[PDB]
Amino acid sequence: TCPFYKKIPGTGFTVDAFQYGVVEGCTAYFLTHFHSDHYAGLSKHFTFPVYCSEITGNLLKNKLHVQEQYIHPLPLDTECIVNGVKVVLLDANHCPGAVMILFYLPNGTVILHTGDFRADPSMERSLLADQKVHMLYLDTTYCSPEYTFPSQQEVIRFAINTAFEAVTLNPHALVVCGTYSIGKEKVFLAIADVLGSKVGMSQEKYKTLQCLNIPEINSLITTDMCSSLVHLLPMMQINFKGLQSHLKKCGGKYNQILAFRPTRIADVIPQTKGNISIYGIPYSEHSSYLEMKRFVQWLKPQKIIPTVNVGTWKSRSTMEKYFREWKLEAGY
Ligand SMILES: CC1(C)[C@H]2CC=C(CN3CCC[C@@H]3CO)[C@@H]1C2
Ligand code: NI
């Protein structure tokens, strides 16, 4: 059955709740972003209203074939009325089109649902700051202090420098980048830009990227693999066997592969077999522990409801202990 943490009390709304059939009482289904665990169950035969960002709506139409009449895109940073309730969509700093949702309940309660997010201090300057928020439905993916990661900018600097050095030393090296969902496009776009190349990919991945409203996208990507020295492959193919196989297909154009898997940064080393090297780089689209803690201590919610790691009693207890520490430290 549909879990409590996907229902919005005092409304006919659910969030990311498409795998449970017709949810009794639901007059509007919100979708925070186009990742498969969240859209699970949506298909071309869905016949209820779906509320989402413009980008998410482009993907629903073109990739899942949801009929146009059921797709309700909303602009960001704008007060909108849906089935008699004021809502705002905010940028989640996750993947393209990903949003947080602010609900202004008829009874005066205000609820924030983060969807999946990477907390940032810039979130402290939006409509979020204009009123008190009582309940927070929180992306707790990395809610433990061992989760430190570098800034996205630091990780991209490492990738650009690594690729440029390798290809300047050997002009016959190919760069390959793994993907299995939308998100983390900066990794392959930044590398291709330093190398003066478009990014080559399958027709299916090209279609997906053409839905994302990226400026000047036609100048950056292509389906002509032969013209490109940065290729995208499915994440499952980023291993010595898959990459050896890909090199054979390039017809003797290349004699080395440098590959990236976007799972201290200065000290990161690759796995190497012969003329193939694979780098795992810590590019995150979710909050680190410290980023999450800063956001929650600024927001000062009355109640937090985790939406990730909820399946075990140990995980639930661990998260509850951190929420109480944070509250006692900051005095709310
Ligand atoms: C974020 C979490 C609340 C859930 C997922 C991962 C966690 C961190 N791990 C690494 C070692 C200690 C602990 C158990 O796997 C916490 C349990
Ligand atoms: Ni996600």
From Swiss-Prot:
Q: What is the effect of changing H286A?
A: Impaired nuclear focus formation, reduced interaction with PIAS and increased sensitivity to cisplatin
Q: What is its induction behaviour?
A: During mitosis. The mRNA encoding this protein contains an internal ribosome entry site (IRES) in its 5'-UTR. This 5'-UTR generally suppresses translation while specifically promoting expression during mitosis, when cap-dependent translation may be impaired.
- List localization entries: Nucleus
Distribution of this protein across tissues and organs: Expressed in brain, heart, kidney, liver, pancreas, placenta and skeletal muscle.
What role is this protein assigned? May be required for DNA interstrand cross-link repair. Also required for checkpoint mediated cell cycle arrest in early prophase in response to mitotic spindle poisons. Possesses beta-lactamase activity, catalyzing the hydrolysis of penicillin G and nitrocefin. Exhibits no activity towards other beta-lactam antibiotic classes including cephalosporins (cefotaxime) and carbapenems (imipenem).
The record's comment on protein family reads: Belongs to the DNA repair metallo-beta-lactamase (DRMBL) family.
Q: Kindly state the subunit structure of this protein.
A: Binds constitutively to TP53BP1. Binds CDC27, which is itself a component of the anaphase promoting complex (APC). Binds PIAS1.
Designated name of the protein: DNA cross-link repair 1A protein
Gene (name only): DCLRE1A
* Residue numbers of the full-length protein present here: 700 to 1040 of 1040
